[PDB]
Structure formats: C-alpha cells, structure tokens
Design a protein around this nucleic acid. Structure first.
Lengths: 188, 58, 260, 140
RNA sequence: ACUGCGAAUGGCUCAUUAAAUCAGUUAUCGUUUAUUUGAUAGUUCCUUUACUACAUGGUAUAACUG
RNA sequence: UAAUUCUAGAGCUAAUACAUGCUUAAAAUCUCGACCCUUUGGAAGAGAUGUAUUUAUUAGAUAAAAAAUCAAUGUCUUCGGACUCUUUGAUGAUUCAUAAUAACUUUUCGAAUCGCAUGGCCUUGUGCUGGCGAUGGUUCAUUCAAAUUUCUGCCCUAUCAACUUUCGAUGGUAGGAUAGUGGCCUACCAUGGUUUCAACGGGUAACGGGGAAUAAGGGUUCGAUUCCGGAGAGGGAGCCUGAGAAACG
C-alpha cells in the first residue's frame, strides 16, 4: 500500500538508492477521506495497538466557539468560502482543518438577548437587577455584528475531522477577519 | 441449574459492596492528615522567614 | 524478529551469574518484573547455584510449589522471578532470612541477617511527580510507587520502606559526606563517602568518593546509592565492607591466613 | 511584509481580547533556550512569525553541539556549514584532511552573511536533510 | 466441543545489498506497547429513591440423536 | 460425490461466549430564579457537577526600598473608612505535569463471574453481618520490548568528470495520511543541492563485526560457519486475525 519509507527517494547527492527489503507493515498509509456535508456518516478504523479512529465521511453540524465572550454552543454549518491550500476544495465543499465556513447565527443571537437584553441590528426584577450589572460589557465590534442581519458568520475549523471524527472551530474576529475579508472579496 | 439465587452468591455482592465503601473511606481520611502536615509546615514558614526580616530589620 | 524474544543462549548470559560453559546450551531467561534484565538474578540461580539446596530444575519447582519461598513478605512461585538489589528472601522451614547485596569483586553475595532487620528495606528515589487529582507520588528503584510523601524529599535521595504495610518511616538527603554504596560499573561494590559532586548541564554528572583508607575514585551519578551518615549504615554490610584490596595484598593475606 | 503567505500567521494559542484595551503591541511569547544561551534582542521585541525558531517556535534543543563556517546563504531560512578535520592512517603514521557539509536552519533574529562562524545545536527533524539550527554567531 | 492463551519464539541458509548493512557512540521536550511488579474507581433507575426485576433480564448455536 | 482436515437439510440445551441493565455517605459550590418590599435588599424552589472523547479560553508567581492617589471594603468603628492579610511543583530549557470555566460525543469504563471454608450477632426470621483467593477492569508509573535519529569509520577502478530537477531533485507556507517527526504524499511559490579533500557511474567468484593463520619490529592475507545484528523462505505483488507479521509447517 501507501508506504512512508524514505528508502525510495534519492540522496542529497542524487544517487539512486537500492531495493533493500520488502515492504514493512509498520510504515503504512491509508486513503484520504474527503468529508462532504450531509447526514451523519462516520466509520471506524483500527490502528497500531488496540486503538481506534473515527473517519467522518459526511456530517452537517458542529460545535463552535465565541472567544471574547467565552461561550461555545452547538450549531449547523452551511458552506465553505475559502481554503488556503487549493481552491478545488471550495468547489466541492470538503471539510479539512483551516477551512473557512459559514454557520447559522441563531443560538448566539438568542444567547445574547438572554445575557444582556439588547438587540442585534436596527420581566422579573431578578433580570434587570443583573442586567444593570453587565452594562459596560455590552457593545461589541462593528464588523462582526454587521452580518447578524443575514445570520451567516465567518468561522475557521480547528479539528481534524478525518482523525477525530468531529468538526469544531471558532469565530473569525476583527484582526484576523480584516485579513481574510480583504482576501475574500479580491481574489475572485 | 445455572443462574439461580443462592446464599453462596449472596454474600459475594455483600463483600463487593463492603469493599469500596471501607476502601474509599480511608482515602479522605489519609488525605486530610497529609494536608494537616502541610498545614502546620506552612505555619512555621510564615514565622521562620519573617525572622530573616527581623534580622533584616537589625 | 517479529515479536519479543524468549530464549537466552548460554554464552550471552550475564557473567556474574557464573554459569559454567558446558552444562547446557541455554541459560535461564529472567521474566519481566521489578528489576532490569542484566541487573538481577532469578530464583533458580539462587536456590541451586548458591545455596546448593536443589540439584535440578525439577527440584526447584518442587520447592516453590510448597509455598515456602517468599520475597518481601509475599509468596512467589515464578521459577525465574527476578530478584534484584536489596531484596529480602525469607525461607520458612529453616528460619533463615537473606538480603541481596553486592560482593567486592562484583558478585551477588550470600548474606544472612537477623529476624528484625528483615522487616524493612531501603530504596532510592528515581522520580517525584504530581499525579492525577493533584496528589503526588514517588518512584523507587525497584518500581514501588508511594503516594503522599513529605515535601522535603527530592530525587536521588533515599527512602526507608516498611515491608509490612508498604509505608515510609524516614529518609536521608543527598549531600557531601554520606555513606554511599556503588551499584554499577567498574568500582562496583565499594563503599566510601562523598567528597563533592560536579555538574554538567545536559550530560552525566560525576561524584568523587573517598574510601576509608583514603583513596579516591569517580563514577557517574546514577551508580550511587546512599546508605547512611558517616560511620553508621542502616543495613548489615558483608565482610570486607567494600574495601578494594590490591592483588599483591591478597596473595600474602591468603598466605599468612593459611594456617587453617 | 510579515503576512505574505496565503494563510494567517500567528503564534498559536495566544489570544488577543479586543474588548479590553492595553497599549502593548501584541502579546508575544518567547522562551529561554537553555545551556547558557542568551535570547537576542530582536526576538523578544521583533515582529516576525516563524514556526521553527528556537526562541519563538515550538522546537527544543538537546543532543549534540557543533561549530563551523558558513559557506552558502542562497536559500530561504537555511544556510550550509562547512566543517574540517584530519584523519589518521596508522601504517603511514600520518594524517590527511577531510570535510563534511551540514545544512542548518536560521531564525530571522540572526543576520548571517558568508564567511562567518556559527555554533549550532540539534533539534528534531525539520526537513528532509535538516537537524540543526543556529544558536550563536560570531563574525569574520 | 464452545470459550481463553500460544502458534510473531525456536531451528536452517547467505541470494540480494558498497554510506546501505554494521560497529563503538547519542536522542525522543518526536511515538506505540499483551504480559509482569506497585498504586488506582460511593457520583451511572426519569431519579436522590415517582410507573418500570437486582433474592439477579433476553435470546441464539456447538458436540450429540436422526 | 471416484475423490481432500468437503459438507447440506430437520430437531435439542449451557457460559468469564454474544446482547442488555439497577443499586449508595454526607458536604460544598454554581447558575436560574416564586415571592418579599424595600433599602445598599434577601429569598423559596429548581437544576448542574465521576472518568474518558474533541475544540476554545484562563492559573501554572518570583532579582531591592517609600509615598501621593481613585474609591471600595475584613476589622476597634476612630461610620473617617485609614487599615489591624496571603499560596504557587519539577527541568540546562517548554504551550510540562496538574487544576478550573463553556460545552461537545453513531457516549468509553465504574465485577448480572468461580473455589474453599463455615463463624459472630440478635427481637430466631433460612434475620443481619463476616474469612482466605481465583479471574476480569480504566488510567498513570514500571519491566520485556519496538520505530525512527546525532557524530566519525568501508575492497579494486579516470580505458568513469561532471551528476540530480517533466515523473520531488534542495528549501518555504498550508492541508492530507501515520503509533508519531519528516517531500511521506498533494497544492501553490522560490532555484536550489553534490563535486579533484574523487561526487555520479562500472566490477565484486562482497552479508557486516567479535575474531583467524603467519609473526624481531612495522605488516600481508582471511572471516559461508557454535555468540550478537540484518535479510530471505520457487520468483514479484496484495491483505486477513492480533499487543505484535506485509508471516509463507
């Protein structure tokens, strides 16, 4: 199969090497799993030792994370816009690490009103007792709420789905978002 | 006859139940005494390092 | 190969066991256990090549199955169980108690001890770490882990272990001027005291040890086993007491002693 | 300049909170290498991002220590060191010269032109043919 | 006969292989590990004891008869 | 059925096989918040917390002294609020061990097993407790290991002087794959790397070392072969079961 030996390449000189042994099981590769979007299909493979890995063949949800507030909720994912390795994964919508997708913004907005009581865009006495407490921490960055009219955020993936099975990540913020948005609307 | 109730099977789940209660009781016993020793060892350490400051005052 | 190996040939067996090179073709191979392979001694080299009690392999298994032989207050029947340094071998139908400790020319010595010294065991300190749920432990040279120690213990110190409950009585630090046994290398089995210890960052540290007759030598740090303060060990030492005698000095000391 | 590559570049797991405000530039992270080596000035307050640097990246230094003269700087973030010795031939009672080239890695904290003489230490495999990177420098 | 463990050790030959093997020497802060030896587990009926067993739930097949 | 360690249909019953599934101390701390009528409020009730899996974000201190200050408070209230208040492992070196906060999961483990003995307590109910040890179990250490890797070292040959890079050759960035590092493979980019101190190619009736024969000293010639290391099972390639094999009874 796919082997990871260095005994088939050339030296730093250029001298062609020689066939030394047959191919050994403890240097093997497997097949690349491409991860589409759809209903949950996850298959399990058996590794060195008695361990276990979960290959994800297609999934549709995830578990994403708001950094600056420090809350991580479970949402759905929609589609990939940008991939820095080759752009044949954006035209097929696979799922790797460092892929930039769009999520639906609904449970973060529904959390935001519960935590503060202030809208996005445009009655027990316990509530305003503590809503008055969280007063100074109310406003956020302009350029991130400015997509809550459409419910499509920008988020990158930080979990390897072919190994761990899952697909999680984190929301783009303004320093990093300034880079990618200049990259997003100019390279097309 | 396999898989019937029997006095022989009866005390085995008694002894198994009696094990981990009598076992794990002793841990929080022995953990407190370890923190007891660490409690007093800090207490002199607040005092004994202040005596350098008594000498640093002199 | 493909898996582990399971035979030991006769000439590849460790030299200080003194198997004679014509009786067979393989040697006993020691099981996986507390002590390392080339630093230990199975229970068949003890009970038929040292004490001469048994005359076969079939006689040793007949001794072990009668549940006589213990190590450290625990019964063993593994016919190649690996007993190593500082282990206590308590037979019962003779009321003898042994302790494994080094000779001077580099061998494992037969040593009889009392019935009261056979209640405890030293052991050095190989690492000290913080375990799961925040408790600390300590690892000895034979592999015992012991949770909840004193904080003043550091690595390369020496603990004293009570073989009954598996617990600690007291401990000895590691600094200049202590009594030290040497458990590996060339000066193997000599006893002396610490002059000082220089340190190399990212390397192997060297101690300088003075004898009692005041002649000095140098070994690496890990072949050094603390025993006690000066003039006062914690164990019953063998004859000679770790004094290196030159070969000139031990011909005539055998000559004049030859009066029988 | 420091953002030329096609993906965003950062010392990972180093978070900037935009809600707070502090007049520092960015929370840079930096370590001490060991063995009595001194982290240079241009790494603690510099602005490069490099994955494979001893004072900033996630590599350790342990193993050997070598020394040699630099003979080619035509790659991007690697150089080539020449080392020279002698070799004894017992029948003829004499010596003969030999040499070996080693390639190492250069953090952008250092500025190395040809002809100098560096000291280098060993890290885990970095490329196909690379296992050292520079840790000190002295000029020509 | 099912289940568990072993069959990856041992024994034999020297065809390939010229910076490869292999020797003395380092490194793992770069990883997997049956076994052995020592530690290690009150929280898990929807529950804090409300229907629904813990004095203990359910099928399927081997050898065997024809 | 001529046949081989070939097997079909019908009928029974077990498990440490296969598939499920209960039990248990008290404490604390969080969020929600019925009410309450109020100042500077305090509250019933509710739920959440083992370990393992995946991601994000904090703690993981330490080089030498004293004020002015913005308020808040522990406290004698001196109703001024001045003060009469801190712990922190190891390494040459870490984003190390280890702990917390939000969560997440074709939800992992947390004894529906077996032999011996047979006692103590009673309201005497087959009531209640209770000895020695076999086998299984999650994670950290440990022992037997394994996989890669640093420095220097090989016989004859110029009638072999230039070799490697489409088809990865030398480096950079991001993914894939693996037990894991790495052009190991895939994308986009740079134009490198080896050489008269002999690269690259050709021969070997060449497995390498410990060692062996001869010996004034220096040396010349051997090592298929009792020990350790590698490779192979008619010649090439592929994979199943397993902790471990690209295995050839």
């Amino acid at each position: 199969g796919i082997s990871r030996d260095s005994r088939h390449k050339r030296s730093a000189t250029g001298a062609k090497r020689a066939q030394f042994r047959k191919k050994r099981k403890f240097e093997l590769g497997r097949q690349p799993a491409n991860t589409k979007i759809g209903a949950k299909r996850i298959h399990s493979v058996r590794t060195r030792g008695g361990n276990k890995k979960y290959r994800a063949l297609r999934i549709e949800t995830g578990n994403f994370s708001w950094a600056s507030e420090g809350i991580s909720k479970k949402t759905r994912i929609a589609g990939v816009v940008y991939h820095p390795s080759n752009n044949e994964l954006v035209r097929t919508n696979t799922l790797t690490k460092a892929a930039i997708v769009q999520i639906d913004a609904t449970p973060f907005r529904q959390w935001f009103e519960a935590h503060y009581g202030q809208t996005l865009g445009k009655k027990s006495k316990n509530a305003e007792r503590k809503w008055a407490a969280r007063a100074a921490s109310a406003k956020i960055e302009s350029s991130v709420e400015s997509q809550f009219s459409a419910g499509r955020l920008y988020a990158c993936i930080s979990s390897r789905p072919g190994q761990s099975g899952r697909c999680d990540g984190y929301i783009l913020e303004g320093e990093e978002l300034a880079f990618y948005l200049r990259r997003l609307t100019a390279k097309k | 006859i396999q898989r019937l109730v029997t006095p022989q099977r009866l005390q085995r789940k008694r002894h198994q139940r009696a094990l981990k209660v009598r076992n794990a009781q002793a841990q929080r016993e022995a953990a407190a005494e370890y923190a007891q020793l660490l409690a007093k060892r800090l207490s002199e350490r607040k005092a004994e390092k202040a005596e350098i400051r008594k000498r640093r005052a002199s | 190969a493909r898996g582990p190996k399971k035979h030991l040939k006769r000439l590849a067996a460790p030299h200080h066991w003194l198997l004679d090179k014509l009786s067979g073709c393989y040697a006993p191979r020691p099981s996986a256990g507390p002590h390392k392979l080339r630093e230990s001694l199975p229970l068949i080299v003890f009970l038929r090549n040292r004490l001469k009690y048994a005359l076969n392999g079939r006689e040793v298994k007949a001794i072990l199955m009668q549940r006589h032989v213990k190590v450290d207050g625990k019964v063993r029947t593994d016919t190649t169980y690996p007993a190593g340094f500082m282990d206590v071998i308590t037979l019962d139908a003779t009321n003898e108690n042994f302790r494994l400790v080094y000779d001077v020319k580099g061998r494992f010595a037969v040593h009889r001890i009392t019935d009261e010294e056979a209640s405890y065991k030293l052991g050095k300190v190989k690492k000290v770490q913080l375990g799961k749920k925040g408790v600390p432990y300590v690892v000895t040279h034979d592999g015992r882990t012991i949770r909840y120690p004193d904080p003043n213990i550091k690595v390369n110190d020496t603990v004293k272990i009570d073989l009954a409950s598996g617990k600690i009585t007291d401990f000895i630090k590691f600094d200049a001027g202590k009594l030290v046994y040497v458990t590996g290398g060339r000066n193997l089995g000599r006893i002396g005291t610490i002059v000082h210890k220089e340190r190399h960052d990212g390397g192997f540290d060297l101690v300088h040890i003075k004898d009692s007759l005041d002649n000095t030598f140098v070994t690496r740090l890990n072949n050094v086993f603390v025993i006690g303060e000066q003039g006062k060990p914690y164990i019953s030492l063998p004859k000679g007491k770790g004094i290196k005698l030159s070969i000139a000095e031990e011909r005539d000391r055998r000559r004049a002693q030859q009066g029988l | 300049t420091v953002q030329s590559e096609r993906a965003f570049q950062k010392q990972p797991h180093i978070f900037n909170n935009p809600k707070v405000k502090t007049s520092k530039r960015t929370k840079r992270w930096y370590k001490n290498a060991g063995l009595g080596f001194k982290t240079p000035k241009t790494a603690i307050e510099g602005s490069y991002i490099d994955k494979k640097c001893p004072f900033t990246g996630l590599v350790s230094i342990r193993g050997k220590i070598l020394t040699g003269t630099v003979v080619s700087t035509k790659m991007h973030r690697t150089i080539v060191i020449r080392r020279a010795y002698l070799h004894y031939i017992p029948k003829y009672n004499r010596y003969e010269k030999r040499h070996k080239n080693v390639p190492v890695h250069v953090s952008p904290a250092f500025r190395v032109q040809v002809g100098d003489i560096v000291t280098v230490g060993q890290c885990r495999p970095i490329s196909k043919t690379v296992r050292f990177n520079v840790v000190k420098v002295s000029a020509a």
